[PDB]
Amino acid sequence: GVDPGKTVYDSRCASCHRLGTYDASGSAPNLSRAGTKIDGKFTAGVSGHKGITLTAADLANLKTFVNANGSHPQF
Numbered sequence: 001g002v003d004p005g006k007t008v009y010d011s012r013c014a015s016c017h018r019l020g021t022y023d024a025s026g027s028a029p030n031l032s033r034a035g036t037k038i039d040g041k042f043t044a045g046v047s048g049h050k051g052i053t054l055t056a057a058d059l060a061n062l063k064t065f066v067n068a069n070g071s072h073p074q075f
């Protein structure tokens with residue numbers, strides 16, 4: 001789940017959000033430890049937040065990515 005979750009985060013939330021030290025640029029909240037807020041903010045297949053629609057697989061993969069990476073290329 002971790003790699004497709006990165007694609008979800010990268011293309012769909014990073015433009016605004018931050019995530020630990022992996023992504024420290026953006027004005028919206030840092031999504032570190034936001035799994036429960038993500039699942040409350042999004043319903044699988046229902047268009048919502050910022051025009052985004054997420055599949056069930058998207059939501060699971062993204063949370064696995066947030067848990068595993070939420071960081072420096074040399075660490």
Ligand code: HEC
Pocket residue numbers: 008009012013014015016017027028029034037038041049050052054
């Ligand atoms: C800019 C167009 C954004 C995009 C792209 C994403 N998010 Fe967002 N998010 C944005 C703002 C300005 C805010 C604060 C106002 C609000 O609507 O809450 C948020 C907030 C969240 C939250 C809740 C934050 C908290 O309670 O601390 C969550 C859980 C969240 N956003 C999730 C989220 C996800 C999973 C995204 C990728 C699919 C995503 N956002 C994109 C702005 C923007």
Ligand code: NA
Pocket residue numbers: 013014015016017018023024025026
């Ligand atoms: Na960002």
Ligand code: NA
Pocket residue numbers: 038039040041042043044
């Ligand atoms: Na949900």
